[PDB]
């Protein structure tokens, strides 16, 4: 976008008979353009050219010329391998665009602050709910697995590294001998759910 490139001070505005064209000239033809552009059309104003901006591959220059010559300049510019943009400076449009950009940036940050504060709170609550609901799950499964009364020995285990073998061993021996062969992914001596955290 030219919004951050072009200034009001680069154009002759409300001119009676001139139009401004923008030409992107290859770096290799930069000096060439500075001279060549003069002969690309009839009725060109002397010493009106300048450089408006520069880039690493090409430069952006403006030219002011007779309205009717717009067609000829562009054609000859094409012939000399320059890319010429028809850009009519519009103070109101460029400002409007900059205001919209800044407004949306401000609104995004403003919502973000409270957004993430709200979400952080709601997600904690969601996590607690996850905990509550699975504690109930384990409650009712324990009831279904063992019957009544409801006093069960329920533990939250934080395994030690590489202890899962020993853990299985110890829990197996601990409960398997007390219940039955009837009860892994299906049959485990206890109620067991994985907490992924």
């Amino acid at each position: 976008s030219l919004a951050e490139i072009v200034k009001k001070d680069d154009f002759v505005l409300d001119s009676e008979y001139l139009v401004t064209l923008l030409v992107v000239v290859p770096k290799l033809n930069h000096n060439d353009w500075i001279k060549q552009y003069e002969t690309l059309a009839e009725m060109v104003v002397p010493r009106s050219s300048n450089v408006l901006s520069e880039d690493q591959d090409s430069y952006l220059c403006n030219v002011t010329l007779f309205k009717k010559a717009v067609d000829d300049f562009r054609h000859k510019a094409r012939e000399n391998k320059f890319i010429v943009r028809d850009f009519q400076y519009n103070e109101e449009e460029m400002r409007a665009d900059k205001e919209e950009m800044n407004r949306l940036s401000t609104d995004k940050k403003k919502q973000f602050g409270p957004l993430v504060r709200w979400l952080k709170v709601n997600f904690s609550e969601a996590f607690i709910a996850w905990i509550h609901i699975k504690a109930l799950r384990v409650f009712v499964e324990s009831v279904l697995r063992y019957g009544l009364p409801v006093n069960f020995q329920a533990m939250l285990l934080q395994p030690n590294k590489k202890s899962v073998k020993k853990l299985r061993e110890v829990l197996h021996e601990l409960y398997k001998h007390l219940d039955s062969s009837a009860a892994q992914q299906e049959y485990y001596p206890y109620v067991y759910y994985k907490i992924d955290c």
Binding site: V12, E16, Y17, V45, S48, N50
Partner: protein, 56 residues
């Protein structure tokens, strides 16, 4: 930039003067046209009135 600007400002001034002056003249000629037409038809009216009165 200042040479092209002064030049186009001068060309604008002359062109604007040329067309504004012709527009003013058009307006003036139309008013003149109305006054002359009015004067003729008023003379015509007077003459027809005299004929009328003669006839009555």
């Amino acid at each position: 930039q200042s040479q092209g600007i002064q030049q186009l400002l001068q060309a604008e001034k002359r062109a604007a003067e040329k067309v504004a002056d012709a527009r003013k003249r058009k307006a003036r000629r139309l008013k003149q046209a109305k006054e002359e037409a009015q004067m003729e038809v008023e003379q015509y009216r007077r003459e027809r009135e005299q004929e009328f009165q003669s006839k009555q």
